[PDB]
């Protein structure tokens, strides 16, 4: 169908019951919930062929499901734990293995919400030596001090998103790798011609969408409540 999943992103504390919902419009008998983890592919949690028909997959422990309508298949984390952090995918199938996947739910389970922290973001301007040597100019964005690892980084030139000339690290690194709740860092590069960097009209912005707490979450610290938010840093082109 249009297979749709709700929510798209969620952060939760450990020990809570969490529900993910899959809905379809084509009314296929067969519905599935999978989780994706790096190096493991997609592993089946549970599947259903009709209302009140439920079958375990390979990794059903810690989960339950309900098929409350032809159109709907719900997945529950019964009591969330950190190793349930994953990208979750619903799917439907026809009778001939024609699968349709939902677009995914990115779920992060953290032990202690007090550790949640938005990134600090900085832009580092191109080297004069790069400019002179190559006639190109590399900007670097650095996002630091964030937790959990649940961000999206993009670049914006004169107000419009760019993909050309960009490379963002595929995974953040741990700032204190010996710690189970270490904060994270992420870098990205945007490379332009030297001519384009040298125009003082041109505006460059690194944007980090961070996913953290909601309005509903309690917050007892003096520091800013680490809600879902955007943090950016910017630089203008420079002739000198």
């Amino acid at each position: 169908a249009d297979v749709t999943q709700t929510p798209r992103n969620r952060i939760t504390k450990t020990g809570k019951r969490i529900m993910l919902e899959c809905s379809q419009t084509k009314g296929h008998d067969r519905m599935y919930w999978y989780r994706q983890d790096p190096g493991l592919g997609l592993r089946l949690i549970y599947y259903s062929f009709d209302v009140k028909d439920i079958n375990k997959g390979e990794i059903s422990d810690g989960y339950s499901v309900s098929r409350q309508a032809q159109a709907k298949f719900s997945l529950s984390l019964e009591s969330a734990i950190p190793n349930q952090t994953a990208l979750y995918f619903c799917a439907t199938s026809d009778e001939s293995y024609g699968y349709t996947f939902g677009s995914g739910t990115r779920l992060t389970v953290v032990e202690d919400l007090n550790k949640v922290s938005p990134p600090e973001v900085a832009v580092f301007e191109p080297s004069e030596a790069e400019i002179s040597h190559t006639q190109k100019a590399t900007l670097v964005c650095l996002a630091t001090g964030f937790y959990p690892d649940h961000v999206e980084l993009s670049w914006w030139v004169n107000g419009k998103e760019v993909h050309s000339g960009v490379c963002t690290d595929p995974q953040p690194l741990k700032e204190q790798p010996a710690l189970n709740d270490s904060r994270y860092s992420l870098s990205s590069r945007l490379r332009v011609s030297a001519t384009f960097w040298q125009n003082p009209r041109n505006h460059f912005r690194c944007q980090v969408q961070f996913y953290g707490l909601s309005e509903n979450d309690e917050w007892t610290q003096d520091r800013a409540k680490p809600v879902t938010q955007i943090v950016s840093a910017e630089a203008w082109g420079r002739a000198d």
Binding site: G39, G41, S103, K136, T138, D169, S193
Partner: protein
């Protein structure tokens, strides 16, 4: 005992060279087989499938796969590796007449053809008036790789390939930084084997 096996979590191909991603299966009766692609930051897209019709199956973008029962294989090929082929690829198989089971995935890394390398280590300053900087190792070819840091207060990223469409130009880079007084860009990459002609500006 029905399963599906992909060989290597991460694999490399030279830009322009034959793409070959392997898949084997263990079903006694031939199964249906599927190849999916997941481009960075997105969901799953079906490239092609074997559904007991043609054994040479063609997919979108010049991808093809031949079902070979005698070697229980279904290898995905494409004639020429392009930078846009960088993604994760999953082989999958029908199981128990009721589901598709997935392989563990292989990420394809495309090594750009760098004809005129210009390895260099540059220092970049914060756009705001801090005393903060990072170090950028860039413009090295395929034979260089970047090592992880040896000092816990020095951070070094994996190498990353950018494709500047404006000048049809690809380049590798890694970033290093530290909160230390000790830290100089001349020493940032000392744990990596760098080209003997790397440019270190004054």
């Amino acid at each position: 005992a029905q399963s599906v096996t992909q060989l290597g979590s991460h694999v490399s191909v030279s830009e322009g060279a034959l793409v070959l991603l392997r898949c084997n299966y263990s079903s006694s009766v031939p199964p249906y087989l599927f190849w999916y692609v997941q481009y960075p930051n997105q969901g799953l897209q079906l490239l092609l499938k074997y559904t007991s019709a043609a054994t040479l199956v063609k997919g979108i973008n010049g991808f093809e796969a031949e079902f070979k029962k005698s070697e229980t294989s279904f290898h995905l090929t494409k004639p020429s590796a392009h930078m846009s082929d960088a993604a994760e690829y999953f082989c999958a198989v029908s199981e128990q007449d009721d589901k598709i089971i997935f392989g563990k995935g292989t990420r394809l890394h495309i090594l750009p053809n760098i004809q005129n390398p210009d390895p260099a280590v540059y220092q970049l300053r914060d756009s705001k008036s801090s005393d903060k900087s990072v170090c950028l190792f860039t413009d090295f070819d395929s034979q260089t790789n970047v090592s992880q840091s040896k000092d816990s207060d020095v951070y070094i990223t994996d190498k990353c390939v950018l494709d500047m469409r404006s000048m049809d130009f690809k380049s590798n880079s890694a970033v290093a930084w530290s909160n230390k007084s000790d830290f100089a860009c001349a020493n940032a990459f000392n744990n990596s084997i760098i080209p003997e002609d790397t440019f270190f500006p004054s």
